[PDB]
Amino acid sequence: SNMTYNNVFDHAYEMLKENIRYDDIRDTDDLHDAIHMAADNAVPHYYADIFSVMASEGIDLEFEDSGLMPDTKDVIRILQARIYEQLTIDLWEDAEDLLNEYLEEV
Amino acid sequence: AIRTISKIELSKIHNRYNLTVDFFNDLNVIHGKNGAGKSTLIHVIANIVNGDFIRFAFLIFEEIKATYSDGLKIVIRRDKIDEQSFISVTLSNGKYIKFAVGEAMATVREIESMLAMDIDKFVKENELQKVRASYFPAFRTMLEAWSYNRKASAFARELFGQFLPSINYPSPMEIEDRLREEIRRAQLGIAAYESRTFSESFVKVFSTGELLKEIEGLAIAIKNGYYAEYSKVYEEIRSLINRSGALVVYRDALRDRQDYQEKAFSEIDNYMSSVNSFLEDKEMAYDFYPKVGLKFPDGSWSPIRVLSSGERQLLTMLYAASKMAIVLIDEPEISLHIDWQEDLLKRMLSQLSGRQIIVCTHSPSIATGYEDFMINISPEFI
Amino acid sequence: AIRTISKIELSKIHNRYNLTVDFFNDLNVIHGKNGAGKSTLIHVIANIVNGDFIRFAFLIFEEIKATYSDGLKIVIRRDKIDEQSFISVTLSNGKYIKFAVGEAMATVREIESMLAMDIDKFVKENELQKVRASYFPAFRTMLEAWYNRKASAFARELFGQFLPSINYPSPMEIEDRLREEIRRAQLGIAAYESRTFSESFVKVFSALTGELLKEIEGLAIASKVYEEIRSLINRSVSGALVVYRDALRDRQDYQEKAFSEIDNYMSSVNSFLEDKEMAYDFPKVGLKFPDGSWSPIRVLSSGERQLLTMLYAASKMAIVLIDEPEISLHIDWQEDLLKRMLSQLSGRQIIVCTHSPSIATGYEDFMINISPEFI
Amino acid sequence: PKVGLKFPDGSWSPIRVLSSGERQLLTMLYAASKMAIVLIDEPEISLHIDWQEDLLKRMLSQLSGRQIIVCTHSPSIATGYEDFMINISPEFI
Numbered sequence: 001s002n003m004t005y006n007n008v009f010d011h012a013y014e015m016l017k018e019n020i021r022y023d024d025i026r027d028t029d030d031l032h033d034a035i036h037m038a039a040d041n042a043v044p045h046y047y048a049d050i051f052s053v054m055a056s057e058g059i060d061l062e063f064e065d066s067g068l069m070p071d072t073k074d075v076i077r078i079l080q081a082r083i084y085e086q087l088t089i090d091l092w093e094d095a096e097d098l099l100n101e102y103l104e105e106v
Numbered sequence: 107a108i109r110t111i112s113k114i115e116l117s118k119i120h121n122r123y124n125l126t127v128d129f130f131n132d133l134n135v136i137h138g139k140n141g142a143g144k145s146t147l148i149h150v151i152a153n154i155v156n157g158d159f160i161r162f163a164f165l166i167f168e169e170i171k172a173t174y175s176d177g178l179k180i181v182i183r184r185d186k187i188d189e190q191s192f193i194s195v196t197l198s199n200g201k202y203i204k205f206a207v208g209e210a211m212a213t214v215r216e217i218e219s220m221l222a223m224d225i226d227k228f229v230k231e232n233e234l235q236k237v238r239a240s241y242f243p244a245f246r247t248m249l250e251a252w253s254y255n256r257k258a259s260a261f262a263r264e265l266f267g268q269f270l271p272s273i274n275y276p277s278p279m280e281i282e283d284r285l286r287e288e289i290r291r292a293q294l295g296i297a298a299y300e301s302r303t304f305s306e307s308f309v310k311v312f313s314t315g316e317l318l319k320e321i322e323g324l325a326i327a328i329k330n331g332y333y334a335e336y337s338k339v340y341e342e343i344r345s346l347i348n349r350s351g352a353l354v355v356y357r358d359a360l361r362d363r364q365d366y367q368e369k370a371f372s373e374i375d376n377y378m379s380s381v382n383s384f385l386e387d388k389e390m391a392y393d394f395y396p397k398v399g400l401k402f403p404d405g406s407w408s409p410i411r412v413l414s415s416g417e418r419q420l421l422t423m424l425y426a427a428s429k430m431a432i433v434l435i436d437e438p439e440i441s442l443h444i445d446w447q448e449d450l451l452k453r454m455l456s457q458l459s460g461r462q463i464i465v466c467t468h469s470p471s472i473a474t475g476y477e478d479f480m481i482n483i484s485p486e487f488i
Numbered sequence: 489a490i491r492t493i494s495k496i497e498l499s500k501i502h503n504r505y506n507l508t509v510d511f512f513n514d515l516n517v518i519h520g521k522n523g524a525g526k527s528t529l530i531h532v533i534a535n536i537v538n539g540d541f542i543r544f545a546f547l548i549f550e551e552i553k554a555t556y557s558d559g560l561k562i563v564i565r566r567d568k569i570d571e572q573s574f575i576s577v578t579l580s581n582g583k584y585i586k587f588a589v590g591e592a593m594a595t596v597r598e599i600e601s602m603l604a605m606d607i608d609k610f611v612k613e614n615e616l617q618k619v620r621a622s623y624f625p626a627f628r629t630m631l632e633a634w635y636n637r638k639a640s641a642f643a644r645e646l647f648g649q650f651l652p653s654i655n656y657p658s659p660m661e662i663e664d665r666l667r668e669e670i671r672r673a674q675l676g677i678a679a680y681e682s683r684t685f686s687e688s689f690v691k692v693f694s695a696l697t698g699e700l701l702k703e704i705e706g707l708a709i710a711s712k713v714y715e716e717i718r719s720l721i722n723r724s725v726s727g728a729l730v731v732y733r734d735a736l737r738d739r740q741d742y743q744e745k746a747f748s749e750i751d752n753y754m755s756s757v758n759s760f761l762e763d764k765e766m767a768y769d770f771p772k773v774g775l776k777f778p779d780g781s782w783s784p785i786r787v788l789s790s791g792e793r794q795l796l797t798m799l800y801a802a803s804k805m806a807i808v809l810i811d812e813p814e815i816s817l818h819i820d821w822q823e824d825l826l827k828r829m830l831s832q833l834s835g836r837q838i839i840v841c842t843h844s845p846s847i848a849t850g851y852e853d854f855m856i857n858i859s860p861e862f863i
Numbered sequence: 864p865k866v867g868l869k870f871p872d873g874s875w876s877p878i879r880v881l882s883s884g885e886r887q888l889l890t891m892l893y894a895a896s897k898m899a900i901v902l903i904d905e906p907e908i909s910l911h912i913d914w915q916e917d918l919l920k921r922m923l924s925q926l927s928g929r930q931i932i933v934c935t936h937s938p939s940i941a942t943g944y945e946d947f948m949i950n951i952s953p954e955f956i
């Protein structure tokens with residue numbers, strides 16, 4: 001029916017797990033680019049889905065870092081950048097235990 | 107709810123008195139003067155129903171019996187062996203758990219987890235968390251002081267003892283942010299239904315004068331969307347109307363847009379009507395980023411800081427009644443005029459139907475119209 | 489139209505030699521052996537054209553004359569009086585600025601700004617930055633080692649402070665740039681989808697042959713609603729069909745216009761490469777072997793990496809100064825590099841300095857042989 | 864001690880002033896002296912034709928009694944020892 005923020009975050013979590021499993025990211029330095037690699041293929045690209053994800057709970061609509069927000073008049077790119085920033089913020093919390101699970105996997 | 111509370115028997119709680127209260131499945135208006143242990147009884151119920159029996163390790167008692175409607179009996183006893191107290195939580199199903207008080211105290215100072223996992227396994231394998239009870243404390247001004255907040259539970263357990271349950275109650279300084287977030291999220295939901303309606307109506311159009319008149323009436327029908335470009339496409343539709351099957355599809359799309367427009371804001375319009383039912387000569391509304399606040403018949407706007415403790419109690423109680431099982435309210439008569447105390451239960455019973463509503467009030471003005479539900483507490487001193 | 493450089497005269501540069509070079513309007517192919525001062529001329533041109541006159545305080549010379557195409561002459565002299573060196577930048581129009589060498593050295597060690605602002609005011613009030621020249625260094629493997637902004641300080645650390653500003657892309661940055669451009673083009677397509685939806689909604693509401701329907705069915709290719717539209721097409725009203733066909737044609741045209749810049753760069757790269765094709769299948773960007781196997785852009789040899797770093801920095805482009813484009817290249821690529829870059833970079837002054845004459849095939853009339861007249 | 868470049872005019876300059884080919888010759892002729900099997904990859908980087916026709920002869924004067932395997936793209940390295948050329952073509956599958 002509709003796509004929420006939790007489904008997008010689960011898809012990004014699955015993509016980050018797949019990137020860690022495939023590319024063999026061992027520390028946070030490689031994971032700083034792996035998180036963007038997982039996030040930029042999981043962001044919605046049908047407009048409706050974007051607004052449905054942004055209209056759901058769990059994710060705020062303001063930038064804690066004003067410099068991370070791009071300087072443009074495209075509103076949908078601003079909301080997509082907010083999605084990317086919130087996804088990076090929420091995945092950096094789980095990055096440590098994902099790294100620990102990968103270390104315990106091998 | 108399913109397992110409503112039928113009868114609770116507390117024996118020698120705090121070594122002072124015995125108390126046995128029978129509850130109905132419906133409203134339970136407990137009326138009694140301060141010092142009756144009403145607050146204690148509410149904390150006992152909230153620490154029984156919501157599966158947080160570990161807080162009973164911080165309570166001095168002899169025998170606590172809780173009977174639900176279906177027939178489940180919970181017997182809690184505090185017995186000490188070799189200078190160490192053990193709490194025995196014996197259910198009617200056959201299983202029973204026992205644990206040391208000092209182990210729970212050490213676990214609580216650890217939070218400052220084996221027993222917590224044991225309690226979770228016990229309440230999960232016996233299914234003791236079917237019905238969750240919400241706790242409305244009588245000290246919600248303290249929750250306004252440390253402005254749902256999660257450190258407020260630790261503050262209240264710090265100054266009221268560790269028997270106090272989890273505190274999940276909204277402050278006046280949090281519901282403003284919650285209302286602003288919900289209004290903007292509903293506007294974004296309207297914009298997403300606009301884009302879905304556009305794609306679906308494109309597919310459906312790809313496949314009388316009354317339909318044109320209905321489209322002209324629906325063109326005129328704040329509730330403006332966040333994506334104003336779709337409001338401009340609607341302006342262009344109104345301009346074209348000013349200048350068969352596809353017209354039927356257009357009419358259906360406009361009708362669905364109007365219906366979703368009403369449905370997105372209906373929950374907050376219900377909460378606003380619930381607030382404005384009490385308030386006179388002052389309207390709380392969301393006039394325009396969304397601004398939420400008071401309005402006057404003079405047209406002046408004002409922040410939510412002018413509100414009195416009475417109106418703050420109504421805001422914090424009507425928001426925490428709309429956002430809802432068993433509901434336990436402690437002292438709803440605080441800082442309220444007598445007419446609002448008369449109509450408060452009728453308003454909350456109109457907005458909270460289908461759940462066991464237990465209220466504890468010191469003023470009998472709260473219990474008008476429900477005098478058959480008035481259970482009078484009486485401490486039987488040991 | 490553009491102030492191209494016509495003739496540069498260097499007198500007693502490094503107290504070693506005199507050099508006077510006349511340039512054509514396009515394709516200045518300087519050919520000479522090592523030690524002839526080619527890069528000593530490219531650095532001078534890049535420090536004259538782009539307004540970087542402060543680098544001339546780090547150069548030992550006697551007289552430097554720069555003549556443009558319109559007739560503007562810039563004469564730079566390094567004269568020292570009473571143990572203090574002064575650089576006199578005298579323009580042909582009458583204006584002239586002078587400054588102490590030690591003041592500029594102190595300003596440069598300060599960056600490690602009054603004179604910098606004075607130089608900026610001098611080059612802004614005379615309009616010396618109409619044409620900006622891009623510099624392709626001969627040490628681009630060092631740029632692969634570390635556009636990067638610290639590379640200027642690293643290269644000036646190990647090549648001296650006369651060296652101009654280094655703005656050149658590494659392979660792992662053209663990889664990041666291509667991935668960013670593909671993501672931006674996908675976002676552009678999606679926004680054109682929603683704009684097309686709203687405008688076609690309005691136009692179909694404004695509306696109230698089988699060949700047009702057949703053309704619309706043929707033009708359908710695959711983004712989810714368009715698949716349903718193609719499925720419905722597979723299973724009076726002429727104006728709405730015309731609107732549908734125009735919307736589909738505009739969607740296809742916008743997809744081509746969004747991807748045309750990267751399809752041009754991919755075609756330019758895959759023109760040289762033979763047993764390996766570079767493409768952007770799904771975003772991962774990399775090689776595509778004829779077996780269908782994929783490989784990262786790290787498998788490429790030094791030759792192919794030089795072609796990647798030169799074709800991207802020619803597509804993302806005035807005056808272009810290329811130093812030694814024959815590095816690590818086979819002879820056929822040396823034969824075809826100038827023809828490919830002249831086909832892809834038209835309308836600018838292409839100055840190249842090569843040690844191998846194989847680069848200058850087919851343009852032998854443009855081969856200007858440099859010769860240092862040692863004092 | 865001070866190692867540098869002496870121009871015929873008598874001026875003295877540091878080793879920063881060398882071009883790309885002179886830097887390649889400094890890095891190549893020094894590691895050839897402090898030497899087994901020598902595997903050289905692309906010795907023709909930034910060298911004109913006259914130095915490419917003699918670099919292999921000079922390094923063979925430096926390296927005697929050792930197996931030399933070089934790989935080049937320009938055939939000007941291969942002159943003077945043209946009987947030792949091994950053309951290579953991969954066998955694709």
Ligand SMILES: Nc1ncnc2c1ncn2[C@@H]1O[C@H](COP(=O)(O)OP(=O)(O)OP(=O)(O)O)[C@@H](O)[C@H]1O
Nearest residue numbers: 502521522523524525526527528880881882883884
């Ligand atoms: N500070 C200096 N910077 C550069 N060259 C200097 C300097 N001092 C003396 N020279 C000499 O001036 C000449 C110019 O060297 P340069 O690197 O420009 O020549 P090139 O062989 O044409 O260059 P490249 O190999 O980079 O194309 C050389 O003979 C060099 O030894």
